[PDB]
Each structure stands twice: as structure tokens, then as C-alpha cells.
Amino acid sequence: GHRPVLVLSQNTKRESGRKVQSGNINAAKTIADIIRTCLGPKSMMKMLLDPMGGIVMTNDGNAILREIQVQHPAAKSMIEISRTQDEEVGDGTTSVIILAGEMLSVAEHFLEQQMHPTVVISAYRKALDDMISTLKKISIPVDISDSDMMLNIINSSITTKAISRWSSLACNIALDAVKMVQFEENGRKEIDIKKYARVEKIPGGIIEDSCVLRGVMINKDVTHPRMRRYIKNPRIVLLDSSLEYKKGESQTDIEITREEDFTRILQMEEEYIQQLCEDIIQLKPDVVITEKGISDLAQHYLMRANITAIRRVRKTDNNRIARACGARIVSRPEELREDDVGTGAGLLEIKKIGDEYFTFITDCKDPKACTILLRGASKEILSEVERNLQDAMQVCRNVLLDPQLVPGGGASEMAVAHALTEKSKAMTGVEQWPYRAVAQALEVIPRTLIQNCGASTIRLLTSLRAKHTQENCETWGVNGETGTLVDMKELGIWEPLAVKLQTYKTAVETAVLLLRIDDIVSGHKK
Amino acid sequence: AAVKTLNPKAEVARAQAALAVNISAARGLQDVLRTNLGPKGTMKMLVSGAGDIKLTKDGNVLLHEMQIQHPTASLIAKVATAQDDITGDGTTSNVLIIGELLKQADLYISEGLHPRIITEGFEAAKEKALQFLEEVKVSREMDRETLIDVARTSLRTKVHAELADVLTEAVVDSILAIKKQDEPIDLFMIEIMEMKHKSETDTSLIRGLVLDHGARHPDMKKRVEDAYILTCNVSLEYEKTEVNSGFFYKSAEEREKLVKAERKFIEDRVKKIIELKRKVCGDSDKGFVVINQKGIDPFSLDALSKEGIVALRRAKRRNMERLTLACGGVALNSFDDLSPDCLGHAGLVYEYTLGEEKFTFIEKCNNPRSVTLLIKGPNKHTLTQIKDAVRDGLRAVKNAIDDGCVVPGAGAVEVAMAEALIKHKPSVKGRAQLGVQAFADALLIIPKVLAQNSGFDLQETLVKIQAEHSESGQLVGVDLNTGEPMVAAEVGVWDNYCVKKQLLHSCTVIATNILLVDEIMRAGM
Amino acid sequence: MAAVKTLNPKAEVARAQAALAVNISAARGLQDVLRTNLGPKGTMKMLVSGAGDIKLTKDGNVLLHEMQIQHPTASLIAKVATAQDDITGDGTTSNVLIIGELLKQADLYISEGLHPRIITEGFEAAKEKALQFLEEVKVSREMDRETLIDVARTSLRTKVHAELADVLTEAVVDSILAIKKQDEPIDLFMIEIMEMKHKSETDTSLIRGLV
Amino acid sequence: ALHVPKAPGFAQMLKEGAKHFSGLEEAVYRNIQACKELAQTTRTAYGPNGMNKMVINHLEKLFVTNDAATILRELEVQHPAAKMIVMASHMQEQEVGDGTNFVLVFAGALLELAEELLRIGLSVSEVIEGYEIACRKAHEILPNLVCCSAKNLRDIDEVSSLLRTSIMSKQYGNEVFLAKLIAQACVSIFPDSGHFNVDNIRVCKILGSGISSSSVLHGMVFKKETEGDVTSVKDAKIAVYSCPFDGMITETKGTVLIKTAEELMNFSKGEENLMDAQVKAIADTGANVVVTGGKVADMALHYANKYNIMLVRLNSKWDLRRLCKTVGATALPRLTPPVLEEMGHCDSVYLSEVGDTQVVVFKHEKEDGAISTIVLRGSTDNLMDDIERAVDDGVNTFKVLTRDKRLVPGGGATEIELAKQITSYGETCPGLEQYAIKKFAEAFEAIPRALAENSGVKANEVISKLYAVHQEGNKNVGLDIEAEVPAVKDMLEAGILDTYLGKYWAIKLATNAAVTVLRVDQIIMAKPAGGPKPPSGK
Amino acid sequence: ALHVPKAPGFAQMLKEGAKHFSGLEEAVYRNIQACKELAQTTRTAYGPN
């Protein structure tokens, strides 16, 4: 008896003070150090062991971070910001983590010196505003009609990935897919590469055979072998309803008292199937694709009219087919009209790849959806190639939306750092020191590039700073392969302004969020 | 470690530890699969958890049946699985080349060299090797003799010499039967059926279909001489109304009338079949065989049997297309408009019983476009081994037919490619010459393993073959009986060009990706 | 499996290639650890015992003793290095490195189907030729003070910091020259080594007497 | 210096429960040892003097038999190589029906001598090649060793004499009586058409009177009782129905909808009248016996009793089809009266009481019919099971004789002649294959050696005498088991003859099993699973 | 593909309870952090105040 009495529940922990801030900053630094070595053209890949027995061998920062389970809430926040950076702009995932870690590292010094976190946060926000201003100032425009410029931009995006060996083919695939997906209806521009640029990976073959198709490709075969597997100019009708007899919604029971009613009812079922098939046939199509089943009798009736049928196609695949061939999905075949019939596909071909049947609706004229067929050594290689292609397409769409570019190879980092230091030279308050700390912590990207290249960090970084102290040197960065200073106008490594802006904003905001925090409380239930 | 600091229960191998782990796993896989290569390789017996015995010599089958839980082994197994799925051959060579590439790369990496230079050398050497392979291929009209040579080359490495000789003729004839001019070969049209009642050499080719089910009515004929074939997908058994019909009667006579009228729908289609049979053949010499994908209830079975019609039910879905291609009829999903032009023809149909199960033979077709391979053997594991062997042989023959080129075997092309790479090495700038040399030495593994399995010594046989190739310029391989250099093209040892190209591409890609891994993490818990 | 395991079920056995791989792996691990010891530019190692005592060293024999290793091949290599230290007093790290590299180079050819006996015969012939060459290349000299200073520096600079090595060089050379008698073996038991724990490390010196 | 670690590579990657065996000593010798152990286990039950073995399986079921296939089936063999040899023995049993013990002992001898050849310096490939060459030589020699042929299969005496040797190995003391029974049963079957069906011979086991009271019945015996008041018919006119003996009902759903009092009061009367009319229509064809595969309605049984109709219910459809074959009837799917060409006939159908079990007997007076039944009596269930196994062996021997009429001498004469001829062929072959050929020839000595060991005499003296006689030029001389000392006698005169097909298939299968076992070089065994059998086995 | 084995060589030869830290991040930074923590613990007792 006499159970203990206490205010908060049991197993409710609480830590406060400098310890919480130090722990949060250390957790952020550890998260950054996890993927520190995965930045630059000379980055080395990491092999992740999925809990479900899979293997993720990747170089992308976001994939590595999302494959890691952590307990410290600061590490959770870092993983979250990496995911948000991946979702917003498509790349910069490993840069933002490093930047946030460096900013928190330089804020810890001021925290240890009797400076309230609010002053640090105010300095960080002023620094971020000036960082955005300088980044917009040092930007350059891009002619999106120039295919060579877009290809070079995509190349600069994918020089750091494992696909840099086939960079030319990868850039062509990404640019073609992005330009094919681009759509505009009712005065609303839209580039939906998530739903209309599908990547299909087929293990085997060689990666040089991978290509983007002027159409879609699904892993389906004809319902009946008599149907043609090769149609030149097919008229495509798309459905999302069953072509078979089904029970009604209301509860219905028949009552048979005479002999012929049973056979009559079965004949009415057959006649309903025939009526549906005749309604479809009246539009004179060449192929019918539906998302629900097709009965055997319906297959017979369609074959009598020389029509190929594909039975059970997913909703997303059917939408992609509709966009590619210009069709319109309908539910009731009796309401099918000429406009709903999809003409525009230039070939229907159901060929065999390996031991499986694949349906090709390629050769479309002006398709608004496409599939990217990837061939490669194995499944993991194809997954990494798909991730690299996703990065390339995201960069291409970012450039298409915002035609501004900024120098790469750490040139933007050093230019913004020098501008921020010059602006801080006029500051008189106590806020100038964290301001300069942010400015200098921006230099972690070129330092990481030099370290990954294997060159001397101190000498190269000092030379880069001295070069940037001049007037027309905002485009001077570091060559990530040879470990030498070079003008980015010669190397050509340029990155979208949107990506840099998102990286900078996310890093500064994560630093502010983690600096605002104290008095961790844990252990309570929901 | 950072990951261990964040996640205490995390397993991490970093940098040199990661490279050592990966290379050790690759070397272990290579050590196991070395003995598989060549017709002189040894046979492995694999026992499952349930005690099932499997005798095999494939690299892929061995890899799946190896009791391994290694990540690098999983990656190599995936690569081999893709190789087997696409080309159908070269899995053992795939594993051996991957392992030797990793070993040769580690030879230079252990001397402080960065793996990136080795990967660059690997890329350059792969490009040069692909160019040389294009140069060395033999574009020949794929007559029967060349296909026989290729099938023999695969099957001798897969099974015993006599069994390989039988399977060579079987596979080549089966491929040639279903082949159509300038048209892709559909391997689904060659059915593979297993029977367990005779010796392994009794495996043969039936120019027709063999079905693992027979007639379910005892009174149906067990042998039909001149048969009309009706391939259908129509349900001849009782089916209920979709809308919950039910019957209502007020007397026993009404119930009898409802019972009699309940089956009129099925009886109508059975009567249509019977009327067609009567129309096509008014005599007893010609026969009628109904092969139905759906079921047939006993009433319809009896009705058909009383008319002298052999009926088979629950046939395989692919058997519809196979029977249409072989017999030459039309698969029917309904009997609305059925006419004699939709009937296939078979010159002999008979049922063979073996133990509890029954088999139906449909032979003597006019010009069958779909044939069957009847695997026969005294044991289940013998049947499985022969099935794997015929899969490899069919893949090899189809690959040889696809592209008219064919590559000399016995490791001759490996030796020539290594020599060409050594010659090209000075043209490579920088320190990638080390990677090129490593790639050449790794390519040289195939003749080494062949000589080792044949019982000779690697160094002497390899140097003799290389000296012979350099002196004469011919494509000389390994003679597994004497060890002397031998011209594979003249003897008849052939390899698929697509298999070699896939080997080069996949091995180079996977080795490059593995060499660049500097950490293995397990922190998803 | 093996014959031994049938008579003794709980017996650990490695046969042929397995045993050779085990030995070579152990030797290569020892070599990988002791690579960083070699030379005056080597890295100091930090050894903490069970009781918590701290020991900083670069010596190969000390590191071999203080690594937490339970391998048989490691035990044999440790015995060889212990004999080296007991007799000559130097070259333990080089001993381990050369043993490991010899095993690795031998495995380079044994993995190609070559029998180890041929490799051992080549090793014997090469060792004979190497001994002849070493006898040819040795520099006979009159051991004045300068040569002894150079030798002591060449050892101590590898062992300790450069300034401490410079002090210890003069200390040891003078100590040896003091107790040396002409044409008589040197008894190292007559150089007392006494530890005091109050001054800096550079205050160590030689007392022409006893403490 | 305390533990030996696992070697890097495959040794470390292997799963915790898995086992790996590689090389000659670790794999081939172990497999040969296991196969030799299995052969030694089954050896003692070989020949007429073989001894029965009580085998209790995992279900506490007791088997008393000297049949090698049955013993191997009941034994829980775990070693994969011995499993392969058991598979070969079962395949021989399926193909021929006899010679399983021959297969087992020959494979064991072959593997033992292969181990000897491997130890003296030969390679696996050379041993396999020599074994294959010697097997081809044996299959070439075997047709020349045929001493006589069946030459008649419709004669009771000749068939009994031919099957005497087959069923003398089991039930040695009393094989003449069993041979006569099986000969009569087989001769009743096997019509003018050359095809002979083994399943047409049925075996009924009833306890009580010892195996000397067994008899053959030209018809069917069912362990059940009639469901009506009629228990005996003298001129039966069986009508067989696969449907239940009841008024059929709708397959969808039956509902008696009553709307007036008259319908309610007349429904049962109408149902009764309808069923009575159906039964009367069936009886009006003369059918005085009705056999059904389904249930029997009470009203149906009442009206069958009223019209003096014998009712027999056969639960299993296999028995129904066997009865239809026996009496020449057609299984009607409806309850309609049978037409004249689909009504079965039988000389007599009656209810009998054999021992303490009630039986229904369908008896034909003629010595013909599609199916014949052997009624086995005995004092023990195990004894009757063993007698049934002997009957199965005799029936399979008759089937083989129908397939091939050639016969070879028994008692080890054929094996000694084959060994002598293959050994003579061995010296003519130069090269390393001569050792394997000679060992293959010597492996045939295991048959007369086992026979002599089981008969209680010295095997070495018997083999020496057999070689002496066969060198003299007598190829039909085998072991004389009717003696207390090593002795030999002519087998052609004694009537101890083996089927040519049995020897051919046994030699082929044993050689194939031994060669396939020899081919294995590495064994990778997964961790055993405690799963309750795969669903395929049901 | 569910567990990461110990690297061949010294990692496998290390005893069960032993710990090995090597390299800049694994050794020097950890030592510096420990010394900084000790100095922080003792810092607040410096001087008259």
C-alpha cells in the first residue's frame, strides 16, 4: 500500500539549459557528418540495408537520411528538412543538411558566450535576407529555347551522380520527358512529372538501350491470343468500368415459377453483354483498355469486330494512356462519343521482353505523357538511375519555371559570403558577430568539395577567398575533380537559382528553429 | 561512429572495412562457383529445409540455393538473376568475372590507389573490349548445323554427354518448328512437360501438344485416329444466375419440370457441339475432340460421350493459343456462330495413363507452330535438372538465331580481348592504365578456371594459349581434354554474342558501383 | 564433416585453403594495424588496460602485447617479435610488416593454383641471396662518438619526439661509452634506469654515478 | 591462441543451421557409407530364406514384411544419397513391381567398389565411364541369357508355374497354393485382347480361417449390408445409378410455395405418388437389383421393398465403376429406368456372412468377366497384408510376362553368368576403365552372396562352385537352397526363373542411381525445417 | 542482406569487450570533446566569485 504520489506521471523526463542546446547542435552536426562525404562530382556511394531485406545503394542525401532511423528529435528535424528540400526543388538535399549543421555549429560558439538565442536568430534572419538579395543579384538569365543550354544545365545537375558516365543520354532523356509532360489548359501552365513522366525499370540489357518513349508502356498482354498484337494506327477507347454482368446496388431477388425463366434470364445476361459490346463497337475502335475485368463473352464479341482488349490496367496507367494518345476515359459505353475515341497513337505493339509481355503505345503525335524505359545490370542499379533521372527532371522543370542561374562549384557560396562580410563591415551592434559567422559558415560547401576532391583545404580556401575579394570574381569556384580554382564561365557548372534559394532558406530556418528550442520534455503518452 | 552515436543498434562498416567486406563476399561467391564452369565442372547436390534434393550446375540455381545472407551476395545474385532472365546463360561467368574484377582492383587499391582511377580504367577497358567483341564476332547464316553446335555447347556444360546429345537435337528441332521468318520467337509456344516413367535419354520432341489431363468419362475413346479439334473456353457445367434467382414450386411435378428446365441453357450449347460434330463427320472413322478451358459437368460429359466425342476440361490458358497454333483451329469463347472452319485437325489423339495421372497426346499435326518437349526421367531431381538444361539450350539457340553473329568459346575471346586491352593500354592517359590492366587480368579468369576444372595448371596453360594466340593471331581457346590451345571456331565451341556483351556491361557496372561504396549501414530499426 | 570432427564432435578445424586463408587474414590484420607505427612520422597509439592505466607508445612489441587479440597466428607472430625484441631490441614493427607482406605475396601466387612448397623454396633461395647482398652492402666503420650518436638518433627519433630524442641520444651514447671496456662485451645491467615524476620530460639526463 | 575462426568467404557467409560438405572424403565417401548402410539394412530380407521385419512408422502402424520397397517406404530415411537410392528402388517397383531388393543391393555393391576404386587412385569420371560401359555390356549380354519363354498365358498350370518363382521369395513355405490362386485370378482377367489391367484384380481381407481358406471369386465383394428386406437374388439384373436413390431437386434452390389449403394437403401425397411411380417404372424393366452411389430416401426404400428390389449402396465411386465393369452396367446419372443395353447382369447376388463380417457378393458362374476378386483369409491383419503384397507381386509378374515373355534363370545363375562375361570383357579393354568394368562385374556377386548368407551356408564356397560350373559351360546353374551345405543345381529344370524385363530394368536403374550418386561432389544442406509438411502432400 | 559482418582482419580478431577507435573523427575529436566537458564541469569554480 501507500503508492507514491508525484505531480507529473512516471517515466516523464525533462532536461533544460545549456545541455539541451549542446545536444541539439551535436545531433545536427552528427546528421551532417553522416552524409558529409556524399557531396560533389567525386562523391562515393553508400550501401543501405533496408529493414525489409532490401538494399539501397545510393548517393542521394535524402535517400540515405530517410533510410536511417534516429531517436534524437533534432536528428528527426534534420531528416524532415532534407525531405522538404527534396520535395520542393528536387535536389540540394545533401547541401542543405551540411549548411544547417555548419550554421548550428557556428551558433553554438555564441551560445556559449552569454548571448541570448533571440539575438542570434535576428542576426540569422538579417543574414538570410541579404543572402537572398545577393543570390538574386549574381544570377544570370537563360534562354529556355536553347536546347544546348538546357542540356548543359542538366549535365551540371547530374555530374555528381552515378549516371555521369551516360550523362549525355540521361540529359537528353530528362529534357525530352520534361518537355513532353509540359501542358497548358484553361490558362494554367503545368509540368506534372510525378504523374505523367513514369519511369519503368526492366532489369537486364544495357543502359545505353534505355530511352524515353513517345507514348506509354504497360506490363500487360492481350486478353485472348486471337487478338492482334500489332496495330499500325489504332483508335483507342479507354474505360474504367467492367465489361461484365454484375449485381445491382439495390437488393434484388428473382422468383421463378415457370420453366423458361431461368434460361431466359441467362440469355438476358448474354444479351446485355452483347449490347455493351455493340455500343463499344459502334465507334469503330481498334483497341479497348479498361481498368476492370472483361468477360469471356465480351472478349468474343470484341474479337468478332477485330478489336484488341487489355483487361485490368491501373488508374494511373490509364490516365497516362489518355494523356499520351489523346483519349478520354469513359464509364458508360452507351455514352461513348467520337471525341472520346483516342486517335493520335502511331503504333500499338505488344512485344516480349525476357519472359514477360509488355504493351507499347509509342509513336504518338504530340503526346502529353511518356514512359522512361530503363535497362541495366540489376534492380539496385536501375533504382539509382531512376533517382538520378528524377533529380535531372526536377532540375529541368525548376529551370523551366525560373530561368535564372547561379554559378556552381562553391562560387555562389563565396560570393555571398564576401558580400555579407562587406555589408557587415558597416554594422555597429552586437548582431554583427553572428552575422559574420553565418557569412563565413556559408563557406562549408567549397571546403567540402575540396575535401572530397582530396586537395589541401586551407591553401585552396584561402586562395578562393583572396580571389573573391576582387571585383569581377563572383563566378570563381573550385574544380571538384582536379582540385584547382577555376572560373565557372569556363567549367560551365551552373545551378538553378531556385535550388540555391531553397537550400539557403531551409538551412537558415532550420538553424533558427533549433536555436529557439530549450527544455526538452519526453516520456508522456498521447 | 556517427550512425552508431545516433542509433546505438546500428551496424556500420566504413571505408577500407566496407571495401574489405564487399571483396571478401565476392571472393567467397567466386570460390564456390569456380567449380561450376565448363563441361568438366563438378555437380552440386542441394537439400532444402523440407529435404527436397536438387542436382544442379547453374550459377543462378546454385546462387539461389546457397544459404547466404550477405548484402554483396544479394547484389551479385540480383545481377545474375537479370542475366539469366534476359540472356539465359552466363551466370557462372558473371559471378566469376565480378569476383576477379574486384580482386584485381583490390590488388592496386591495397597499394594506396584510389578506387576512382580503377573505375575509370574499367570504363575505358570496357569500351575497348566492346569494340573488340564487335570486331571478332562471326556473322554466319544460322543453319541447322550451327544451331546444333550452339545447343551442344550449352547442354554439354549442363548435363552428361549422351543426354546433352539427345537434348541438342530435341531443342534445335523444337526451336526450328516454331520459328517464323523474320519474326521474333515466342518461347511460350514450346511446352515443357515432365513424365516420370522412363530413362533420361527417352526425352524427345512431340510435334504437337501433350496435356497433363485426360477424359473424365470412362466411356470416352482412349485413342482417336483422325480427330477434329475444338478449342473452346465456354462453360459446359451448371452456372447459377447472377441475381439470386431461386425456384418456387407448389408440387412435385412442378419441381420435376423445373429440374428438367434448369439445365436447358447448358444443353443448348452441348446440342450445338453435337450438331457440329454430326455435320463435320457422319462416319465413325473421323473423331471429335473437345478441349475446354472451363469445366464440364457429368451430365454434359455423358451427353457428349454418347455421341462419341472426347472431351477435356480445365485446360491451361496458354494451351488455347498452343492448340490454335498447332492444330490450326480457332479458340472460341462462345458457340454463337461455330462452323467447320473453326475446327483444328490432329492426325492422332490418344491418352496415356501413368500411375494416378493421365496424359493426352495430340500428334501428327499438319504443320504445328507450337510443339512440346516431353521430359522423361526416373527421379524428380533428374527432371528438374533436364528442365533447367533445356531452358538454357532454348535460350542459347534463340539468342543465336536473333543476331546472326556468334562468338568463339573456350575462353578464346577472353584471351584475345585481354591481349587487345594490353595493346591499347599505353593509349590511356593517366593512372587508368592500372585499371585497364586489372580489367584484362579479370577477363583472363575464364580460361584459367576452365583449365583448372579440366585438371591442368592455370599458369602454364594460360601462357601457352596466350603465346599461341600472339604468334598466329587466331582465336585459340582451351582444349579441356589435352590442355593444348585449340581453335574454338573450327572445333565448334560457340558462345552467344549477346551473352558476352551482357557479361561485359553488367560485370563492369556492378564492379564499378561496388568499388565506390565506402560504407554499409543498417540503421532502419 | 572432417575426420577430426567425427572423433571429437566439438572440435574446431580449418583444412587446407581454409587454414591458409585464416593464417593470411590474421597476418594481414596485424600488418594493417602495425603499418602506422613505422618511421619517425608514425602515429602514437593509446592503450588503456582493464584497470584503466594509460600507455602511449609506438613500439611494435608493446602494441602487439597490448592489443586485445586471441588469434593463433597472431600468437606465433607475437612470439617471433618477442624473440626479436629480446635479442636485438629493435625491428619488431618491421618484423610484423615483412611477415605479413611475405604471406600476402605468397597468397598472390598460391591462389593461382601454385603449391606453397615452390613458394617456400623460392623464399629460401631469395633469403640466401639477400643475406649475401646484405653482407656485401654493410658499412664497416670505426664506432666513434658521431656514428653512435647517429644510430641512437635514428632509433630515438622514431621512438619519441624530436627534441626529447635529441636529449636521449646524448644521454644513451654517453651512458654506453662510460661503461664500455675495450674488447669486452657490454653489460647493460650496469646502466640503472630510474624514474622520477616531478620535472619535464626534457630534464632527463645521465648521472655519472648511482641513484 | 584459444579458438579457430571460420575461414573468410563462404564459411563465414553460410547460415547458422546450414551444412556444407565438399571434396572426396567429405562428400563422396560419406554418401557411399550411407548407401552401404541402407543396403546392409535391407540385405537380410533377400530371397526365399529372407526374414520379415517388424517396422513401426511414425504413426504407430506395424508392418510385418520382407518386401524391400515397403520396408524402405516405412523407414524414415534422411540421408540424401540413401534417399536417391530409395527413389531408384521405388521407381523399379512402379515400373516392374519386383526387383527392388536387387536394385538396392546392386547399388550398394557398386558404390562400395566405386569407393575402393577411388581409394586405389582412380578418378570419379573414370569410374563412372567404366560403370556405364559395363552396364551397356550387361544389357547387350542379357538377351543371350534367356533360357525359355512363357509361350502361353491362358493356361492355369503354366501361369501358376511361372508365378511360383515370383511369389516363392515371399511366403516361402506355401507358394504353390498362392500361385494357383493368383493364376486363376489372372486367367479370368486378360481377355482375347492382349492388354492386361493390374487394377482388375481386387483383394478382400477377412479374418478368421487362416490363409489356406483363401479363394478366388469371379466378381465383387463389398463389406456392407443390403439396405432393404431383400438379401438374395438368383438372376440379378443390376441397375446402377450414380445419383442418390431419391427424387432429384433443383440445383439452384428449392422452396415449396403454398398458397391454398389444397396444395398443402396434396403436396406430400403427390410426392409419394411420384416416387412410387418412378420406383415402379424402374422395377417394370425386370431390374431386381439397384445399386446407388448416393443416399437412399426412406420412401424410396419403402417402395423398393414393396416391389422386391435389392438395394446396395456403394459410397465410393471407384467401387461403383468397378461394379459397372464387372456386371457390364452403365452408371445412370438420373433415376430413369435403364434401357436394355445398359442394365447389368450377374449370375447371383446375395448377402453372405464370412467370418464375422457381413458382405454383399456379386458372383459370376462363368470363368470370365472384367474383374475378379481374391478373398484372403487369415488369423492376423499383418499376415493378410503380407499375403496381399505377395499377390501384388504375382500380378505384376503376370503383367510383365504379358509385356515380355522372355525369362532368365534365377537363384543367382544370371548374375554369375553376367559377372563372368563382363569380367572376360574386362581384360580385352586396355586403359583405366578395365578396373571399373571388373568392379562392375564383381558387384553382381552380391546377389548369390546374399542368397547364400540368408540360406545359412558359406557364400564363398557357393560362389566358387558357381564359377566352376559356369566355366564348365552350364549357364542355368544357380544356388540350391534346399540343402544344408553349399550346393548348386540347374535352375531351368527346377523352374526357378526370373523375368527378363525385371533384370533389365533393375540393372539399368541401379546403375543409374549409383552413377548419379557418384556425380555429386559438393553438398549444401539447408537448415532442417519443422514445418507440418508442404500442402502438396495434403 | 540483413546484417553487416565485421571486416576481415583486426576487427574480427578484437576481443569481445575491447574497443578500437582510429582516425581523426573517431579519436581526436572525441578526446577533445571529453576534455572540453571536463573543463566545463570545473569552470564554474574559478576566481573569487
Add this chain to the structure above:
Amino acid sequence: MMPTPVILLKEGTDSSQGIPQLVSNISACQVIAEAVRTTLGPRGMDKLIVDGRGKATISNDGATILKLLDVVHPAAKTLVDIAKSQDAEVGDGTTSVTLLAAEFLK
């Protein structure tokens, strides 16, 4: 005997062979006969056997007594089987059959 790393038959398989096993079989048959020996003749007695549930059966019939005994010895079960066979075919003498068989073996 040697461990034989991979055994032929699964663990727990018990094998008895030779003269000793047949002598043991004869002894078991003797025990079974003795179990019903006293119930023979006009001066015979009855045996009471209690099952697991607790119900008792009192009988002089040899076949009933042998059936009620849970005999598991494979050789001793033959005496019970022949007692059942004699009961089925004849109905009397179910004790004499067991006595005679065991006496033959003895």
C-alpha cells in the same frame, strides 16, 4: 558405432536384431499368455480391468481381456490379433489360441 555427421535414419530410431530380439519376442508372448492364463477351464477365474475413465470390466473371455490390455509390443500384438480372429470365426476358445501359440514359442 561412429557419429556419421549426416545420419541415415532420423534420431530416435530404435533397431533390435538377431537372436536376442526374437527371444525377447517369445518372452513378450509368454507375458501376454500369462495375462489370461488363469481364466481357462471350469475352475477358471475372472479378471477386472479399469480403464482411464474409471469404468471397470469383469470378464472371463480371453479376447475381451486381451483387447482391454493396451498391448504395444509388436510381437505380443499377434496373440491379441489371433484371439480376435478366433473370436470372429468361431466365438469360443480365445484363451486356448493364445496359450497354444505361446507354448509353441516357448
